[PDB]
Structure formats: structure tokens, C-alpha cells
Amino acid sequence: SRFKVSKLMAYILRHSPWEFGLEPDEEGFVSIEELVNAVRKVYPWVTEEYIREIVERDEKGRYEIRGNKIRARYGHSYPVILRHEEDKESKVLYHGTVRRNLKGIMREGIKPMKRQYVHLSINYEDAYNTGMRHGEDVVVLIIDAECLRNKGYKILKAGKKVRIVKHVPVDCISGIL
Numbered sequence: 718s719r720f721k722v723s724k725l726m727a728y729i730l731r732h733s734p735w736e737f738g739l740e741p742d743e744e745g746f747v748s749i750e751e752l753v754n755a756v757r758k759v760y761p762w763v764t765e766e767y768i769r770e771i772v773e774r775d776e777k778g779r780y781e782i783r784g785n786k787i788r789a790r791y792g793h794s795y796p797v798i799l800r801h802e803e804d805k806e807s808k809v810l811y812h813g814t815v816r817r818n819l820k821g822i823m824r825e826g827i828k829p830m831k832r833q834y835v836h837l838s839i840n841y842e843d844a845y846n847t848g849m850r851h852g853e854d855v856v857v858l859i860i861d862a863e864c865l866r867n868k869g870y871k872i873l874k875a876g877k878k879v880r881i882v883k884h885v886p887v888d889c890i891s892g893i894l
């Protein structure tokens with residue numbers, strides 16, 4: 718199914734490409750042809766056309782293809798530089814987290830998890846679902862995006878609904894829930 722195959726591509730492209738004989742470039746890209754061969758190690762009926770279709774109809778925009786290269790657009794557990802086009806338009810963004818993080822955040826702003834990017838959402842609902850990954854007691858931080866831009870931070874369009882930024886100073890957090 719597209720769900721199973723996409724789950725496997727997400728794992729390969731974000732977390733364990735070398736286990737499959739793939740070597741991503743600095744931007745997280747691998748050969749889509751080698752990705753097909755890798756995926757076929759698990760799902761032998763997968764075609765390059767199928768993976769291109771998964772990318773095209775992925776509801777979150779998780780993936781990006783350029784010529785023969787394919788990457789996950791965000792969520793990597795290894796070093797990548799992501800030169801996504803800038804979100805210049807959003808005025809308020811959202812960050813899902815858990816209540817016990819508030820103390821730390823109120824001290825030092827939102828810092829990345831070594832990832833070098835903080836994940837924000839354009840929608841409260843998706844920020845909430847994202848925060849639910851780290852526990853049940855979820856709070857959603859309202860983020861002033863103009864405040865971020867004024868301080869010099871560039872907000873990038875990582876996915877259809879995901880936005881990434883280097884850091885969120887306390888000053889730019891305007892509300893909770």
C-alpha cells in the first residue's frame with residue numbers, strides 16, 4: 718500500500734539510508750533509482766513510477782524530487798542543509814510540545830534537538846498532533862513569525878504545512894494554546 722511503502726521511504730530517507738546502501742548528499746538527496754532498488758529489497762513490486770506517484774500525492778509534502786534525486790524534505794536524524802524557499806507570508810505559526818518543556822522554553826526559547834531546526838506548523842491542529850509525539854499533556858505555543866523575521870531568522874517552507882526555523886526566542890512566543 719502507499720502507506721507502507723511511504724513509511725519505509727520515510728525511514729530510509731530520514732534515518733537509515735546507509736543500511737540500504739544509499740549515501741545522501743549534503744542536502745539529503747539520494748538517487749531515486751537506487752531508492753527503488755532499496756525499497757524493492759522489502760517490497761519487490763515497487764517501481765520508480767510508484768515512488769514518484771507517492772511523492773506527488775503525499776498529503777503533507779514529505780518528499781521532494783529533482784531530476785534523478787529524491788529526499789525527505791524534513792525530519793532527518795542526520796546532518797542535512799535544507800535550502801527550502803522562504804516563507805515570507807505567514808504571520809503566526811504554531812509549535813506543539815509537552816507541558817514539562819515550558820519551564821525550559823521560558824528560560825531559553827525553543828531550541829532544536831541537535832537537529833539544527835525547530836519544527837513549526839501553520840495550523841494549530843497539526844502542531845497539536847506533532848506535539849502528541851512527545852506525550853499526552855500537549856500544549857501548543859503561538860509563535861509571532863514577524864518577530865522571528867525581525868530578529869534575523871529565516872522561516873522556510875519545509876512541507877505543505879511544516880515550517881522550519883533555526884530557533885525561537887522567548888520574545889516571539891505570543892500565547893499558549
Ligand SMILES: [Cl-]
Nearest residue numbers: 736737738758
Ligand atoms: Cl536492510
Ligand SMILES: [Cl-]
Nearest residue numbers: 791792793834
Ligand atoms: Cl528537519
